[PDB]
Amino acid sequence: SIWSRIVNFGSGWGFWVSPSLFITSTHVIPQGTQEFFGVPTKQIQIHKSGEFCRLRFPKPIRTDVTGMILEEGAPEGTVATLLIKRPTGELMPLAARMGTHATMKIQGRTVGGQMGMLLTLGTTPGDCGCPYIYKRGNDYVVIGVHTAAARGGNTVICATQ
Ligand SMILES: *[C@@H](CC(=O)OCC)[C@H](C[C@@H]1CCNC1=O)NC(=O)[C@@H](CC(=O)[C@@H](NC(=O)c1cc(C)on1)C(C)C)Cc1ccc(F)cc1
């Protein structure tokens, strides 16, 4: 049911935080489109924090979902889950131990986020946009969306804010 919140968006993915709140990666948003989920973009309030992109819709799109907690990353050392959906449909939950929160230089662009290390295949280019989630007590907490990963190593970057 939490997987039903990850949706094909552009060249990547997006996650329904609330009935009205879609989050995704800036690199993934289609730039030639004038409506998202049937709502015209003129009526959609889009806020960008580097690679973390937040789309607030005028009217709730997903009646069925409950709102989730959104926070700027997780505490250093938290083992989050990277809910990767694949274009084939397969679901790849990945464990990532999150680390330093920082503003990073990724390919000349400035990016706020949190680095993480995948624990024990890996991530690929279709995967930008998928959410990082960890359970805190009884509530799930979404902390960011996948934006990058080191060519050499396990490092994954989770765009935040
Ligand atoms: C997802 C988006 C995509 O395909 O867009 C094309 C622009 C893709 C996912 C990664 C590719 C391989 N595995 C992935 O998880 N993201 C990107 O291609 C971003 C670039 C990278 O991932 C590079 N990584 C780094 O530069 C890097 C830096 C650090 C600390 O760790 N890795 C490649 C080595 C893959 C696109 C991007 C995002 C944000 C930016 F500011 C610039 C560029």
Author numbering: 4 to 123, 132 to 172
Paste lines from the article.
The protease plays a crucial role in viral replication by cleaving the polyprotein into individual nonstructural proteins. Their active site features a catalytic triad with histidine-30 (H30) as the catalytic base, cysteine-139 (C139) as the catalytic nucleophile, and glutamic acid-54 (E54) as an acidic residue which orients and stabilizes the conformation of H30 (15). The substrate binding pockets S1 to S4 in the HuNoV protease, which accommodates the P1 to P4 residues of the substrate, are in the cavity between the BII-CII loop (beta strands BII and CII, residue 102–117) and the DII, EII, and FII beta strands of the second beta-barrel.
To ascertain that similar conformational changes in the BII-CII loop occur in other GII-Pros in response to rupintrivir binding, we first determined the crystal structures of apo GII.4-Pro Sydney (2012 GII.4 variant) and GII.3-Pro to 2.4 Å and 2.6 Å, respectively, followed by their crystal structures in complex with rupintrivir to 2.5 Å and 2.71 Å resolution. These structures show that the BII-CII extends from the closed conformation to the same open position observed in GI.1-Pro. Unlike the GII.4-Pro HOV-rupintrivir structure, the BII-CII loop is not involved in any crystal contact in these two structures. As a result, the BII-CII loop does not adopt the hyperextended conformation. In GII-Pros, but not GI.1-Pro, the BII-CII loop switches from a closed state to an open state to accommodate rupintrivir. While rupintrivir makes backbone hydrogen bond contacts with the inflexible portion of the binding pocket, that is, alanine-158 and alanine-160, the molecule relies mainly on van der Waals interactions to bind the BII-CII loop.
